[PDB]
Design a protein around this ligand. Structure first.
Ligand SMILES: COC1=C(OC)C(=O)C(C/C=C(\C)CC/C=C(/C)CC/C=C(\C)CC/C=C(\C)CC/C=C(\C)CC/C=C(\C)CC/C=C(\C)CC/C=C(\C)CC/C=C(\C)CCC=C(C)C)=C(C)C1=O
Ligand SMILES: CCCCCCCCCCCCCCCCCC(=O)OC[C@H](COP(=O)([O-])OCC[N+](C)(C)C)OC(=O)CCCCCCCCCCCCCCCCC
Ligand SMILES: CCCCCCCCCCCCCCCCCC(=O)OC[C@H](COP(=O)([O-])OCC[N+](C)(C)C)OC(=O)CCCCCCCCCCCCCCCCC
Ligand SMILES: CCCCCCCCCCCCCCCCC[C@@H](O)O[C@H](CO[C@H](O)CCCCCCCCCCCCCCC)COP(=O)(O)OCC[N+](C)(C)C
Ligand SMILES: CCCCCCCCCCCCCCCCC[C@@H](O)O[C@H](CO[C@H](O)CCCCCCCCCCCCCCC)COP(=O)(O)OCC[N+](C)(C)C
Ligand SMILES: CCCCCCCC/C=C/CCCCCCCC(=O)OC[C@H](COP(=O)(O)OCCN)OC(=O)CCCCCCC/C=C/CCCCCCCC
Ligand SMILES: CCCCCCCC/C=C\CCCCCCCC(=O)OC[C@H](COP(=O)(O)OCCN)OC(=O)CCCCCCC/C=C\CCCCCCCC
Ligand SMILES: CCCCCCCC/C=C\CCCCCCCC(=O)OC[C@H](COP(=O)(O)OCCN)OC(=O)CCCCCCC/C=C\CCCCCCCC
Ligand SMILES: CCCCCCCCCCCCCCCCCC(=O)OC[C@H](COP(=O)(O)OCCN)OC(=O)CCCCCCCCCCCCCCCCC
Ligand SMILES: CN(C)C(=N)NC(=N)N
Ligand code: SF4
Ligand code: SF4
Ligand code: SF4
Lengths: 215, 176, 170, 115, 96, 318, 70, 156
C-alpha cells in the first residue's frame, strides 16, 4: 500500500468509512537484528544500527557509539564530538525532510516531496564525501569518527546551509496557511499530555502535546 | 529555551476581519500556492542527462571490489584473513597454502556480492592494500550466480580498474 | 490431469459451445486418468530404481470411468449445467477439422477427438505406480484443484465433499 | 437519426476496443492471478457484505433538491412572459423555500454524518 | 531577448555539423548542447565540458557507435567508458 | 459525409487525449523541477503511443469474484459517453445542433457517473466498493450545485443553445458578467471530472488505485481515455460558456483557434491545480458544497433571476 | 527547459483544430458553399421544405430567384 | 522471407512499446526503497524514460523487490507477483533482495527473493545508488529489446 510504508499490515474494522479499531500487524520487516548483534563483535554490529532507522543513520550510529563508550570508560576527542553533532543535525534535516514530504504525499501533495528530495540529494553527497556511502555511512564509531573531513567539506556545507532556509520557506508557502492542509491536519490525532506520557511517546509527540522535554 | 509554534490570536479590528473575509471568499493563499508552482515551472530543471552525465563521486566511494597487485605484478594479498575476520556479513571465503616458490598466497578468494553490505571494513583491515572497493558501481547481472565473485574475477577487476583505483588511493591515503 | 492439463480443462471448457457433444453419448468409452504428481513421482523413482533400467511401465489411475460419467462429474464439480448430446463421429471429425485451422494452439483437432473417443487399454502385464512405490491418487481427491477455477462466484467456496463421487467401472 | 448514428458509432468503437483488448494479447490465467486484491493478503470477509452509509439523510435531501432544480430549470422560458411580477414572485418563492429547507436541515444537524 | 535565444539555438543546430548532426545528437543522446572537446579515447567516445552549466551537468560524454564488436548506435551503457574517463566524468578529479 | 464528420470528431479527440497525458506528465515534471518524458521520442512525443501499445498488448484479466457482464460494460459506457459529450459543442458549428444542448450534456454526465459505480461494484473488492461510494457522495454534491449554477448562467443567456451562447458573448465575456458563478463552476467541474483536489474515487494514497483497482490492460486504458476526454470536454464547455470568442461567419477558423487556445489554457490550469494542492476528504467536499456553495448559489440564482427584470435586459427567447 | 512542453501542447492544439474546421468544411461542402441551415422551429423547417420543393432538384440550398419567377 | 520480415518488424514494434513504457509497482520494503525515491527525484528522473509508479499490481509491469524479504512477508510478495498480469519482470535490488544481505543467517529472512519469484535483473549494493538502479532499469530495457516472441512463434 502506498500509505502503509511497505511493510505494515493494518487490520482495520470499519463501520462505513469510520474506523472502529486498528490492529497494527508488524514484524513483516523483523530480521533478528538483536540475535545477529549477539553473534557479532562491537565493530561488526555498527552497520546493524546503521540500518535500523535508515532515515537517521548517523543518529543511530551516535547512539550506539555513546553506549559503547560509556561502557568502555573512554572519551571522544573534541573535534570528533563537534563532527558528530554537525552530522547529527544534518541527519535531523534529512529525516525531517523525509517525514514532512512523505506525510504531505500521503495527504496528496507531491511538489514539496520533489523539491526537498533534491535537497536530500545534496546532503547525500555530503555523506558520500565523508564516508563513501550515500546513506549507510558507518562513519561514527565508538571512540570518535572513522576519518577526518576532506578539505572542502565545510565550505560546501556552509553553502548548503546558506541556501536552505529559502527551501524551507517554499515548503511552508504550500502547506502552512493552506486551508486544505489545515482542514486535513487540524484536530486530527489529538493526544493529551498524560496519555502521551503513559503510552510512552517521545520527541515530537510530547512536544506537540505541549510537554517541555528534550534530551 | 522554547518557542510556541502556534499560539497567536488574530486581531478583531474591522480591517483585519475584512481582510480575513476577503481571503475566505477570494482564495488568496490558494493563488499564492499557484504562483509558487508557476515560479518552479519557469526555473531550471535539476535533472542530469544519464547515462551521458554522471553524478559526482569522491575518492572514498565504495563500489565493486578488486584485488590489487604490486607494480612488479605480484599479488598484494598474503592470505592473512583479516578481511575475512572483520567482514560483518561473512561474505569472504579464503583458503590458502604455500605456493610453488614458497610464498604465502591464496588459492581461493571468494566474495559473495549478494551477501556483502559494501561497508569497506575489508579495505580498512588489509595491511597491504590488496583488497579495495573500486569506483565501479554499474555491475548488475542477469543471474544470481554471476554475483558470486572468485579470485580470477576479482583479479580481473583489479587489472581493469587499476589506474583509477591507484588514483583514488593516492588522493585519499593521507586521511587514513 | 492437473492444474495445467488438457484433459479436465478440455472437458470443462465446453461450456462456451452450448452443450457437451459426445460420441455415442460417451457410453462406449472407458478412461482411467492418472494424476500429474503421481506421474512425476514415478518418473523420479524410475531414475532411482536400479531394477527399472530397460523396462516399460503403465501409469494409470485407480478407478476406470465411462466418458459420460466422467464428464458429468467434471461439470458437477465445476458447478456448471451439464447438457450432453450425441454427435455422430463424422460430424465431430468435421468439427475438429474446423478448429485446427487456427495458426495458434487449436482448441481441438481430429486426432484429439479420436483420442478422447478411444477407450484406455488394459495392460495388466506391465508394471505400474504400485511397483514403483507410488499409491495412485484418485480423481475425487484432486479434481477440485483443477476445477475450482472454472466455477463462478456463487460456487467458488463450495467444499470438496459436496459432490458425490462418479460411478466407477472396475 | 444523426444522434442515433453517433451513439451507434461511439458504442461500436468502444466495443471494438474491448474486443481487441481481450483477444489480441496472450492469455495465461490461473487461480492466484484472478483472486481478489487486498494488498497481498486474503480478504477476511466478503465485498458483498453491507457497507454502512453515514450520509443516508443527505442522499434523500439530494433527491428532494434534485426535484427543486427540475422545477427551476424552465426559468429561461418563463422570463419571456408578460406577467413578469407573478413570474418573479413565484421564482423567488421557490428559491426561498429551497433555502428554508437547507436552513432547517443545517440547524437540525441533518448535514452531520452519522458517527 | 527571444532573438538571442533563437540565435543560440541556431548556433547549436550548426554546432553539431549541420542538420543531420543535430538530429543524430538529438535522437541518440536527448541533448543538443555544445561544449568544448576535452578529449577522445581510443574507443571513439567523445568528452565535453561546460563550466557555465550547473554542477553535475558541466561534463558529458557522447558514446561511440561501435565498441569492441558490438554495435552501440542506440544501446549505450554507462559502463562503456574506460576507468580514467570514468573518474573524470564522475568528478573524483578535476584533471582529464 | 456525416460519418466522415463523426470520424473527424472522434479520432482527433482520442489523439488530443493521448497528448494531454503527455502534456500533463511534462507540466507536472517542470513544476516539480524535473523534465518529464523526453527519451521515447523527440521531446518525448512517442510516449503516449508507447503507452497505448503496451496497454493494449498486455493481458487483461477478469477477477474470479467479479460480475463479468457489468465488469465489461462499465468501460464501454464510460468511453462512449466521453466521446458523445463532444457532439453538441459549437466550434463554431456543432456536429449535432440541439435546441436544448445544455440539458443533454447534464443528462449524459449524470449517466457517465454510473460507469465508475458499476465498475467498482462489479469488481467485487473492498477498495473498489469504497471508491464507488466515494463516487456516489461526490456526484450528489457536485450535481446539485452544477445544476443551479448552469441554470443561472444560461438565464443570463436566454435559452439552452450553445450557438446562442456565442451570440450572447459576441461583445463581452460571461466571466466579466458573472465571475462568482464562474469560480464556483470551475470548482464544480473539478469535482465532476474527479480531478485534484477531488480525486477521491481513484485516490491512490488511501485506496490502491480506487474503483479501477482490478482493471488491467485495455479496460484500464478505456477508463483513462474517458477521464481525460471528460477533462478536455469540461474545459471546452467552460471556455464556450464564460470566455466567449468573436465569430466571423465567412472565416470560422478564427473562432476555432480562439476556442482551442482557451480550452488548452483551462486544461493547463487543471494540471496546475493538481500539481499545487493537497487532496480533500470526501466528507469535507460534501460539506464544502452544501454549506458554502449552495447558499451562495441560491442567492446568486435569485440575483440573476431578478437582474434582467429590474434592468429591462431580458434576452430574446430565440 | 519549460519550452520543451510546447511541442506536446502544439500537437494537442493541432488535434483540437481538426474537429471544428472539418465540421465547417463539411457543412459548407454539403450546402453549396453556404452555411448549413439552422431549423430550430417549425417555421424554419417549413421554409427549408419549401426551398427543397421550389428548387426542382430536391435540394434546399439550390436557391432560385427573379430569373426563376420570370 | 516476407513472413519473417513482417514478424520481425511486428515484434520490434511490440518490444519497443514494452521497453519504453515501464510501470513499476509501488512496493518498497526497507532502506533500499529510499534510493528508489531518489531515482524518482528530480536528479535522476525516472519519468524521463517512461518509468512510472502504479499502486495496483494489475497495472504494473515491473516488480522492484527493494528490501529484506522476511518469512512473514514472502506470501504477500508472491501474491502481488501473481496478481500482476503478464508480461511481467522482476528487478531484485540490493543485497537483501539478491541473496541474504546482512541478514543471510537469520531465522526470519528469506535468503533471496529468487526463491519466491523469477528474477530478471539483480542490482548489487547496500543500497545501490540511484545511478546503479537506473543502470539496472536500462539493462532490463535492453533485455526486453532482445525478446523475439513472434519470431519464435513463426518458426514454431
Ligand atoms: C513504494 O514506496 C515508494 C517508492 O518506491 C520505493 C517511490 O519511488 C515513491 C516516489 C514516487 C512518487 C513521488 C510518484 C509515484 C506515484 C504515483 C501515483 C505516480 C505519479 C505520476 C504522475 C502524477 C504523472 C505520471 C503520469 C501518469 C501516472 C499517467 C499514466 C499514463 C497513461 C495511463 C497513458 C495511457 C493512456 C493512453 C496512452 C491514451 C490512449 C491512446 C490513445 C487515445 C491513442 C489512440 C489514437 C487513435 C486510435 C487514432 C489513430 C488514427 C490516426 C492517427 C489517423 C487514422 C485516419 C484514418 C482516416 C485511417 C513513493 C512516493 C513511495 O511511496
Ligand atoms: C462478436 C463480434 C463479431 C464482429 C467482429 C467485428 C470485427 C472485430 C475486430 C477486432 C478483432 C479483435 C482481435 C484482433 C486479432 C488478434 C486476436 C486473434 O487473432 O483472434 C483470433 C482467434 C485467436 O484464437 P485464440 O483464442 O487462440 O487467441 C489467442 C491469440 N493470440 C495467440 C494472438 C494471443 O482465433 C479464433 O478464435 C479462431 C481461429 C480459427 C478457428 C476457427 C474455429 C471456428 C469458428 C470461427 C470460424 C468460422 C466458422 C464458420 C462455420 C460455423 C458453423 C460450423
Ligand atoms: C436508449 C438509447 C437509444 C435511443 C435514444 C434516442 C434515439 C432517438 C432520438 C430521436 C429524436 C432526436 O433525434 O432528437 C434530437 C435531440 C436533439 O435535438 P433537440 O432536442 O434540440 O430538438 C430536435 C431538433 N430540432 C430543434 C430541430 C427540433 O436529441 C437529443 O436530445 C439527444 C437524446 C439522447 C438520449 C440518450 C439516451 C441514453 C443513451 C446512452 C447510450 C450510451 C451507451 C449505452 C450502452 C453501453 C454499454 C453497451
Ligand atoms: C496531427 C498530429 C498527429 C499525431 C502526430 C504524432 C507525432 C509523433 C512524433 C513523430 C516524430 C517521430 C520522429 C522519428 C522517431 C524515431 C527516429 C529514429 O530514432 O528511430 C528509427 C526507427 O524508425 C522506425 O524503423 C520506423 C519509423 C518509426 C518512427 C516514426 C513514427 C512516425 C509517427 C508514428 C504514427 C503516429 C500516430 C500513431 C497512430 C531508427 O530505428 P532503426 O533504424 O531501426 O535502428 C537501426 C539504425 N542503425 C542501423 C543505424 C543502427
Ligand atoms: C496509439 C495508436 C495505435 C498506434 C499503432 C502503431 C502505429 C505506429 C506506432 C509508431 C512506431 C514508433 C516506432 C519508434 C521507433 C523507435 C525509435 C528509436 O529510438 O528506436 C530505435 C530502434 O527501435 C527498434 O529497433 C524498433 C522500434 C520500432 C521500429 C518500427 C517497427 C514497425 C513500425 C511500423 C509498423 C506500425 C504499423 C503496424 C502496426 C499497426 C532504438 O533506439 P532505443 O534503444 O530504443 O533508444 C534508447 C534511448 N537512448 C538512445 C537514449 C539510449
Ligand atoms: C472561468 C475560470 C475561473 C477560474 C477560477 C480559478 C480560481 C483558482 C483555481 C484554484 C482553486 C481550485 C482549488 C481550490 C478548491 C477549494 C477552494 C475553496 O475552498 O473555496 C471555498 C471557500 C472556502 O470556504 P471555507 O474556508 O471552508 O469556510 C467555511 C466556513 N464555514 O469558500 C467559498 O465558498 C468561496 C467561493 C467563492 C465565493 C464567491 C465570492 C462571493 C463574493 C460576492 C460579491 C459579489 C456579490 C454579487 C452581487 C453584486 C451586488 C451589486
Ligand atoms: C457459440 C459461442 C462461441 C464460443 C466463443 C468461445 C469464447 C472463448 C472460449 C474459449 O476460449 O474456450 C476454448 C477452449 C479452450 O480455450 P481456453 O478457454 O483459452 O483454455 C485455456 C487454455 N490455456 O477450447 C476447448 O477446450 C473446447 C473445444 C471442444 C470442442 C467443442 C466442439 C463442439 C462445438 C461445435 C458444435 C457444433 C454443433 C452443431
Ligand atoms: C465469434 C466470437 C467473437 C468474440 C466473442 C467473445 C465472447 C466470449 O465468450 O469471450 C468473453 C470475453 C471474456 O471472456 P473471459 O472469461 O475473460 O476469457 C476468455 C478470454 N478470451 O469478453 C470479451 O471478449 C468482450 C466481449 C465484447 C463486448 C461486447 C459487449 C457489447
Ligand atoms: C498494411 C497492411 C497491414 C500490415 C500489418 C498487419 C498486422 C497488424 C497487427 C495486427 C494485430 C496482430 C496480429 C497477430 C500477430 C501475431 C500474434 C501471434 O500469433 O502471437 C502468438 C505468440 C504466442 O506465443 P506462442 O509461441 O504461441 O507460445 C504459447 C505460450 N507458451 O506470441 C504472442 O502472442 C506474443 C504476445 C503479443 C501478441 C499480440 C500483439 C501482436 C502485435 C500487435 C501490434 C498492433 C497492436 C495494436 C493494439 C490496438 C491499437 C492500440
Ligand atoms: C519504505 N519506506 C521507508 C518508506 N517511507 N516508504 C514509502 N512508500 N513512503
Ligand atoms: S565491504 Fe564489508 S560486507 Fe563487503 S566484503 Fe568488505 S567487510 Fe564484508
Ligand atoms: S586483509 Fe588483505 S592481505 Fe589479508 S587476507 Fe584480506 S585481502 Fe589478503
Ligand atoms: S541491501 Fe542494505 S540498504 Fe538494501 S534493504 Fe538490505 S540493509 Fe537496507
Amino acid at each position: 500500500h502506498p500509505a502503509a510504508h511497505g511493510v505494515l499490515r493494518l487490520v482495520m474494522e470499519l463501520s462505513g468509512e469510520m474506523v472502529r479499531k486498528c490492529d497494527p500487524h508488524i514484524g513483516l520487516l523483523h530480521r533478528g537484528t538483536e540475535k545477529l548483534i549477539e553473534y557479532k563483535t562491537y565493530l561488526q554490529a555498527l552497520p546493524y544500527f546503521d540500518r535500523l532507522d535508515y532515515v537517521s543513520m548517523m543518529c543511530n550510529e551516535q547512539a550506539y557509539s555513546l553506549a559503547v563508550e560509556k561502557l568502555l570508560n573512554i572519551q571522544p576527542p573534541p573535534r570528533a564530538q563537534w563532527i558528530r553533532v554537525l552530522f547529527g543535525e544534518i541527519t535531523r534535516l534529512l529525516n525531517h525532510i523525509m517525514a514532512v514530504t512523505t506525510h504531505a504525499l500521503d495527504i496528496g501533495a507531491m511538489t514539496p516531496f520533489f523539491w526537498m528530495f533534491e535537497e536530500r540529494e545534496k546532503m547525500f553527497e555530503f555523506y558520500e564525501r565523508v564516508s563513501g556511502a550515500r546513506m549507510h555511512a558507518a562513519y561514527i564509531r565508538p571512540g570518535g569518527v572513522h576519518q577526518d573531513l576532506p578539505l572542502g567539506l565545510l565550505d560546501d556545507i556552509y553553502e548548503f546551509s546558506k541556501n536552505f532556509s529559502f527551501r524551507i520557506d517554499e515548503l511552508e508557502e504550500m502547506l502552512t496557511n493552506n486551508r486544505i492542509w489545515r482542514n486535513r491536519t487540524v484536530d486530527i490525532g489529538v493526544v493529551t499530555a498524560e496519555d502521551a506520557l503513559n503510552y510512552g511517546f517521545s520527541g515530537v509527540m510530547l512536544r506537540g502535546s505541549g510537554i517541555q522535554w528534550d534530551l | 529555551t522554547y518557542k510556541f509554534v502556534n499560539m497567536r490570536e488574530p486581531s478583531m479590528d474591522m480591517k483585519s476581519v475584512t481582510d480575513r473575509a476577503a481571503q475566505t471568499l477570494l482564495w488568496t493563499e490558494l493563488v499564492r500556492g499557484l504562483g509558487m508552482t508557476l515560479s518552479y515551472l519557469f526555473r531550471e530543471p535539476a535533472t542530469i542527462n544519464y547515462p551521458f552525465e554522471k553524478g559526482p563521486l569522491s575518492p572514498r566511494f565504495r563500489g565493486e571490489h578488486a584485488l590489487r597487485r604490486y607494480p612488479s605484478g605480484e599479488e598484494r594479498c598474503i592470505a592473512c584473513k583479516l578481511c575475512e575476520a572483520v567482514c560483518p556479513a561473512q561474505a569472504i571465503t579464503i583458503e590458502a597454502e604455500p605456493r610453488a616458490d614458497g610464498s604465502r598466497r591464496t588459492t581461493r578468494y571468494d566474495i559473495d556480492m549478494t551477501k556483502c553490505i559494501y561497508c569497506g571494513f575489508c579495505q580498512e583491515a588489509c595491511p597491504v592494500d590488496a583488497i579495495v572497493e573500486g569506483p565501479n558501481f554499474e555491475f548488475s547481472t542477469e543471474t544470481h550466480e554471476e554475483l558470486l565473485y572468485n579470485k580470477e574475477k576479482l583479479l580481473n577487476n583489479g587489472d581493469k580498474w587499476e589506474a583509477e583505483i591507484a588514483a583514488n588511493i593516492q588522493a585519499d591515503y593521507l586521511y587514513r | 490431469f492437473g492444474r495445467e492439463d488438457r484433459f479436465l480443462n478440455y472437458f470443462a471448457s465446453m461450456r462456451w459451445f452450448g452443450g457437451v457433444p459426445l460420441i455415442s453419448l460417451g457410453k462406449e468409452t472407458v478412461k482411467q486418468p492418472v494424476y500429474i504428481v503421481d506421474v512425476s513421482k514415478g518418473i523420479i523413482n524410475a531414475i532411482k530404481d536400479p531394477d527399472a533400467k530397460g523396462k516399460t511401465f503403465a501409469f494409470v489411475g485407480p478407478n476406470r470411468y465411462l466418458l459420460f460419467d466422467l464428464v458429468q462429474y467434471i461439470f458437477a464439480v465445476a458447478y456448471r449445467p451439464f447438457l450432453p448430446y450425441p454427435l455422430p463421429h463424422f460430424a465431430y471429425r468435421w468439427v475438429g477439422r474446423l478448429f485446427e485451422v487456427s495458426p495458434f494452439e487449436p482448441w481441438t483437432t481430429r486426432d484429439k477427438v479420436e483420442r478422447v473417443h478411444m477407450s484406455d487399454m488394459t495392460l495388466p502385464h506391465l508394471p505400474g505406480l504400485e511397483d514403483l512405490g507410488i499409491q495412485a491418487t484418485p480423481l475425487e481427491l484432486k479434481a477440485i484443484e483443477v476445477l475450482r477455477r472454472h466455477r463462478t462466484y456463487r460456487w467458488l467456496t463450495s467444499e470438496m465433499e459436496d459432490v458425490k463421487p462418479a460411478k466407477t467401472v472396475n | 437519426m444523426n444522434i442515433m448514428l453517433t451513439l451507434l458509432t461511439n458504442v461500436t468503437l468502444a466495443s471494438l476496443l474491448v474486443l481487441i483488448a481481450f483477444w489480441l494479447p496472450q492469455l495465461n490465467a490461473y487461480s492466484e492471478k484472478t483472486s481478489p486484491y487486498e494488498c497481498g493478503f486474503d480478504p477476511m470477509g466478503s465485498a458483498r457484505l453491507p457497507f454502512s452509509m453515514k450520509f443516508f439523510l443527505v442522499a434523500i435531501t439530494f433527491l428532494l433538491f434534485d426535484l427543486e432544480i427540475a422545477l427551476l430549470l424552465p426559468l429561461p422560458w418563463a422570463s419571456q412572459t408578460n406577467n413578469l411580477k407573478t413570474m418573479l414572485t413565484m421564482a423567488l418563492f421557490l428559491l426561498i423555500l429551497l433555502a428554508a429547507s437547507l436552513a432547517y436541515e443545517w440547524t437540525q444537524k441533518g448535514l452531520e454524518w452519522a458517527e | 531577448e527571444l532573438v538571442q535565444v533563437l540565435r543560440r539555438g541556431l548556433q547549436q543546430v550548426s554546432g553539431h555539423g549541420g542538420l543531420r548532426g543535430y538530429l543524430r545528437v538529438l535522437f541518440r543522446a536527448n541533448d543538443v548542447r555544445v561544449g568544448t572537446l576535452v578529449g577522445e579515447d581510443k574507443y571513439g567516445n567523445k568528452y565535453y565540458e561546460d563550466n557555465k552549466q550547473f554542477f553535475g551537468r558541466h561534463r558529458w560524454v557522447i558514446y561511440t557507435t561501435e565498441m569492441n564488436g558490438r554495435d552501440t548506435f542506440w544501446d549505450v551503457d554507462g559502463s562503456m567508458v574506460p576507468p580514467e574517463w570514468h573518474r573524470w566524468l564522475h568528478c573524483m578529479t578535476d584533471d582529464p | 459525409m456525416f460519418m466522415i464528420n463523426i470520424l473527424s470528431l472522434i479520432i482527433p479527440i482520442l489523439l488530443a487525449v493521448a497528448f494531454l497525458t503527455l502534456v500533463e506528465r511534462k507540466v507536472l515534471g517542470y513544476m516539480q523541477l524535473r523534465k518529464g518524458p523526453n527519451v521515447v521520442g523527440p521531446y518525448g512525443l512517442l510516449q503516449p503511443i508507447a503507452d497505448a501499445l503496451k496497454l493494449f498488448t498486455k493481458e487483461p484479466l477478469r477477477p474470479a469474484t467479479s460480475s463479468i457482464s457489468m465488469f465489461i460494460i462499465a468501460p464501454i459506457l464510460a468511453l462512449s459517453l466521453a466521446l458523445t459529450m463532444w457532439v453538441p459543442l459549437p466550434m463554431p458549428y456543432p456536429l449535432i445542433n440541439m435546441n436544448l444542448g445544455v440539458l443533454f450534456m447534464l443528462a449524459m454526465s449524470s449517466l457517465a457517473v454510473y460507469s465508475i459505480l458499476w465498475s467498482g461494484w462489479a469488481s467485487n473488492s473492498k477498495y473498489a466498493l469504497i471508491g464507488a461510494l466515494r463516487a456516489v457522495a461526490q456526484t450528489i454534491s457536485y450535481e446539485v450545485t452544477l445544476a443551479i449554477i448552469l441554470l443561472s448562467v444560461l438565464l443570463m443567456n436566454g435559452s439552452y443553445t450553445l450557438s446562442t451562447l456565442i451570440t450572447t458573448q459576441e461583445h463581452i465575456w460571461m466571466i466579466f458578467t458573472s465571475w462568482p458563478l464562474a469560480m464556483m463552476w470551475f470548482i464544480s467541474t473539478l469535482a465532476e471530472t474527479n480531478r485534484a483536489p477531488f480525486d477521491l474515487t481513484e485516490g491512490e494514497s488511501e485506496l490502491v488505485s480506487g474503483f479501477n483497482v482490478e482493471y488491467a490492460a485495455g479496460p484500464f486504458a478505456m477508463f483513462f481515455m474517458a477521464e481525460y476526454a471528460n477533462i478536455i470536454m469540461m474545459n471546452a464547455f467552460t471556455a464556450i460558456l464564460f470566455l466567449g470568442a468573436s465569430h466571423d461567419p465567412h472565416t470560422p477558423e478564427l473562432y476555432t483557434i480562439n476556442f482551442v487556445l482557451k480550452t488548452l489554457a483551462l486544461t493547463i490550469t487543471f494540471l496546475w491545480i493538481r500539481a499545487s494542492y493537497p487532496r480533500f476528504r470526501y466528507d469535507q467536499l460534501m460539506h464544502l458544497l452544501w454549506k458554502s456553495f449552495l447558499p451562495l448559489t441560491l442567492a446568486l440564482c435569485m440575483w440573476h433571476i431578478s437582474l434582467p427584470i429590474m434592468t429591462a435586459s431580458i434576452p430574446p427567447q430565440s | 527547459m519549460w519550452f520543451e512542453i510546447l511541442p506536446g501542447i502544439a500537437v494537442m492544439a493541432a488535434c483540437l483544430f481538426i474537429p471544428g474546421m472539418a465540421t465547417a468544411h463539411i457543412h459548407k461542402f454539403t450546402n453549396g458553399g453556404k452555411e448549413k441551415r439552422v431549423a430550430h422551429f417549425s417555421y424554419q423547417w417549413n421554409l427549408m421544405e419549401r426551398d427543397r420543393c421550389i428548387s426542382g432538384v430536391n435540394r434546399y440550398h439550390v436557391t432560385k430567384g427573379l430569373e426563376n419567377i420570370d | 522471407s516476407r513472413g519473417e520480415y513482417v514478424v520481425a518488424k511486428l515484434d520490434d514494434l511490440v518490444n519497443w512499446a514494452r521497453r519504453s513504457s515501464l510501470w513499476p509497482m509501488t512496493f518498497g520494503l526497507a532502506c533500499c526503497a529510499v534510493e528508489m525515491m531518489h531515482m524518482a527525484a528530480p536528479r535522476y528522473d525516472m519519468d524521463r524514460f517512461g518509468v512510472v509508479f502504479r499502486a495496483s499490481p494489475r497495472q504494473s509491469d515491473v516488480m522492484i523487490v527493494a528490501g529484506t524479504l522476511t518469512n512473514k512477508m514472502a506470501p504477500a510478495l508472491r501474491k502481488v507477483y501473481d496478481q500482476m498480469p503478464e508480461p511481467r519482470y522482476v528487478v531484485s535490488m540490493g543485497s537483501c533482495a539478491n541473496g541474504g544481505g546482512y541478514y543471510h543467517y537469520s531465522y526470519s529472512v528469506v535468503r533471496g527473493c529468487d526463491r519466491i519469484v523469477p528474477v530478471d535483473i539483480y542490482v548489487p549494493g547496500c543500497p545501490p545508488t540511484a545511478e546503479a538502479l537506473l543502470y539496472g532499469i536500462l539493462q532490463l530495457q535492453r533485455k526486453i529489446k532482445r525478446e523475439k516472441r513472434l519470431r519464435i512463434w513463426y518458426r514454431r
